Amino acid sequence: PNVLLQNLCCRILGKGEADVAQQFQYAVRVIGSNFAPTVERDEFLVTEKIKKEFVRQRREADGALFSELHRKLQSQGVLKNRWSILYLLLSLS
Amino acid sequence: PNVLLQNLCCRILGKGEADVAQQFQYAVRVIGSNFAPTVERDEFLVTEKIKKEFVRQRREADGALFSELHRKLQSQGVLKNRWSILYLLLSLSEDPRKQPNKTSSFAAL
Amino acid sequence: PNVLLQNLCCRILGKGEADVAQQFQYAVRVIGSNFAPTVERDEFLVTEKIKKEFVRQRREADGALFSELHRKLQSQGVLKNRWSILYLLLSLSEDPRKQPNKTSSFAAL
Amino acid sequence: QKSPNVLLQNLCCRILGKGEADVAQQFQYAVRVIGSNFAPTVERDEFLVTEKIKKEFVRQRREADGALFSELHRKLQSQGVLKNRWSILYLLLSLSED
Amino acid sequence: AIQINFIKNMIEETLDDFREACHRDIVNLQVEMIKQFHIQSSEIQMLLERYSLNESLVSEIEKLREENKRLRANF
Amino acid sequence: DIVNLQVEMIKQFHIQSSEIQMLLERYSLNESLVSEIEKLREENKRLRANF
Amino acid sequence: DARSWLEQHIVHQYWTSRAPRFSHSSHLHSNLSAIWDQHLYTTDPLYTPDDKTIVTETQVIRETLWLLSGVKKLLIFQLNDGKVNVRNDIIVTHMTQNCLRSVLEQIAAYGQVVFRLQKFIDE
Amino acid sequence: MSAVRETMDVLLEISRLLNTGLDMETLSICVRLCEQGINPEALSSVIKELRRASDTLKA
Amino acid sequence: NMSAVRETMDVLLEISRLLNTGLDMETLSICVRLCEQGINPEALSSVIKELRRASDTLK
Amino acid sequence: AVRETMDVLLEISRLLNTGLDMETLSICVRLCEQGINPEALSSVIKELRRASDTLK
Amino acid sequence: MSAVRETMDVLLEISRLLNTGLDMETLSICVRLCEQGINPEALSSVIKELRRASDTLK
């Protein structure tokens, strides 16, 4: 977990370090603050909320396409917790 | 970006350059702390809102006038984020029947 | 205003004439911060909220009574700060319900 | 005895799964949190709290268990050792889980 | 229309009460922010007094000075 | 939602404050350190002008 | 300062909490409540220490004087003008809380009649 | 002096009904500060911390 | 007395279990003692969640 | 472009009975074109107006 | 790594629909973080703030 947090931080600012020590320490601070999910393992609703947002941005064609992409993940049956990643995509929607 | 903020502080308040200090430290800090936008690129909700404001201020006439000047801004093609200046005006609206708190030497309280 | 807020601190605690310095220092800080109150001036709007509050603790007879008292209040003196007093009282209201816990052991934690 | 300070330490010791003096660092942190004030969402009427617990039972698809809860409530009322039933009831309601 | 406005009047009443509950929380939030910063300063203020300088030592430099002047006022 | 912001803030304050207290002590120098600086200063003056 | 002068020449307030508080005397049998409370707090695992209005020993007999003929009492709760009863937080240090309740409940029910008999008076 | 006293007395009537639970003297200070410009929200907040602080102290 | 407190505990304990809890009987006892001793219900609920969370990160 | 816009914006402010200066609006166009959140832009200026009040 | 990349392509596409720039590399790292049972709410707070920091700066 610790190094996986450090990698992520370097990659978003642009590959290779260049005084990103502070930014990693800042993210350690964030992750030590306890936040609390609103729903947990309710992946289906998290897809539904995305779609309601896409009507909200007036980007309805994107909203049809997203449904196909989630259905893809559903067929493959990869274990990581599908709800975790979708909840990430909702915050950025 | 900074230069802009300094010019807002110094100019309105007058030249202390050390008594306009407060606003300047305040300014850089407030804008740098990121948040995701709310009332952005939905100008239809904003126009309607300012019309209600006029209706409330007992100036029905100013609402039709405003709508005319609004459409004049669109044709110019300048000022990227229109909504932000409109948002600002509405916050500081006041009705012609009261006036909000003015006091000075507030530090003493 | 320094004198008035210090005397405010001393009076409420019922004692401490230079021992309430710490509480005072806090009060000077809170007041020095700024607020934007939801509903700003205008006498009608505050009177309406007070009546709803009266009904809710089941004190109807009091709601009717207050309204005469409000007209009377006005007649006795007219301010531009009238509203700030009525909103101040409003926020500072107390519910009759429940015990307000112990303070005789709650002090210790 | 049972002073607040002595009871808050015992709670922390068992829940964190570490010794008495080894839960201290969290123990201090626990005192600040309790000594910072909050006010419950439901402040008035003992009934307003009870109906909430009762609504929760239905929501979780456990209608039968909410009936059982009403029956327990009468039992609690009759013994009269506690004079702040509501605090205890709001507290379990909040810590409810599936 | 009548029933449309009926529903409309019911919802404002309910929303107003809801604003007050939210407002009370926001006001409780402010009491905590400002009060915590005030605590922090008091803690920092004392710690900083003790280890950044010794009041004890400095009083002692002034004393020795005074002892030596008094020694020289006795010759 | 409000409760979550309140309880996090206070955790951040306690943690930071404790870390701040240790740090402050480091550069300013503790009472042990002041007394020992004086010992070495007495010794050095004594070789250079009381020998 | 005038506030402090009043506070010494008048007995310390017990209708509002903003006056410091006595419940001390040098006799060994007059601090009985502090002893009684202590006992309850260690014997009973489930003891609820009340928030008690500290009174002001043997000034309860002055409130018995007023109550028996004279005015409505706003220091004690009266549910109505025909029902006088005594608040559950009154302690005197040289008795138990419960023991205290029991003498004040006799005079309460005797002041219930004179207060009721006073509502019949049509001036 | 006549005008001022007569608003306060009307003001004390409301305070006792609405269940403010403040004292007479303290209220006069609240009103003077308002007329000189104060925010209401801040002012209630300060009152509240002072109030709680007094109860705990006495016990 | 001993009997009566047990029954008081017993009923509360039944309710905690229906609602699902991670607290044992010992901890639950402590909470009640806190309730009687004052302590608004929200502060208690919060301190518990933060302490429950920290234990999982450690173990 | 900045000036042309400032006059139309100046018309709007006068209607709302809200005082802003000529200068403020022109600086605002500069901040927008660099990118500013609508909340932020409003908040700096609201406070700056109150600061000016207290100061004198 | 082959399985992680395949998933990573699916998330890269979703990221285009909402119109957020993310490197491919970061999208792979997110996968490791939720497999380890990292909190998605802390995770999002990291993604939002560091990507935004990078865009405002440049």
Residue numbers in the entry:
A (entry chain T): 9 to 101
B (entry chain Q), C (entry chain S): 9 to 117
D (entry chain R): 6 to 103
E (entry chain U): 597 to 671
F (entry chain W): 621 to 671
G (entry chain J): 207 to 329
H (entry chain s): 8 to 66
I (entry chain r): 7 to 65
Paper text:
The γ-TuRC has a helical shape consisting of 14 spokes, each containing a copy of γ-tubulin presented by the C-terminal gamma ring protein 2 (GRIP2) domain of one of five paralogous γ-tubulin complex proteins (GCPs).
We subjected the purified X. laevis γ-TuRCs to cryo-EM SPA and identified a subset of particles with stoichiometric NEDD1/N-GCP3/MZT1 grapnel density. We, therefore, subjected the NEDD1/N-GCP3/MZT1 density segment to focused refinement (see “Methods”), improving local resolution for NEDD1 to 4-5 Å. The very C-terminal NEDD1 helix segments were an exception, as they were predicted straight, but are kinked in the cryo-EM reconstruction. Our cryo-EM reconstruction resolves a tetramer of the NEDD1 C-terminus, comprising two consecutive helices in each protomer (NEDD1598-648 and NEDD1651-670; all residue numbers refer to X. laevis proteins). The interaction between NEDD1 and the N-GCP3/MZT1 modules is characterized by complementary charged and hydrophobic patches. In addition to direct interaction with NEDD1, the N-GCP3/MZT1 modules also share an extensive interaction surface with each other, suggesting cooperative binding of N-GCP3/MZT1 modules to NEDD1. In contrast to NEDD1598-648, the NEDD1651-670 helix breaks the fourfold symmetry and forms two small dimeric coiled-coils that splay out from each other. One protomer in the upper dimer of NEDD1651-670 contacts GCP6223-240, which is part of a larger region of N-GCP6 that lines the inside of GRIP1 domains of spoke 1 and 2. The lower dimer of NEDD1651-670 appears to make little to no contact to spoke 1 and 2, but its conformation is likely stabilized by an unidentified wedge density between the upper and lower NEDD1651-670 dimers.
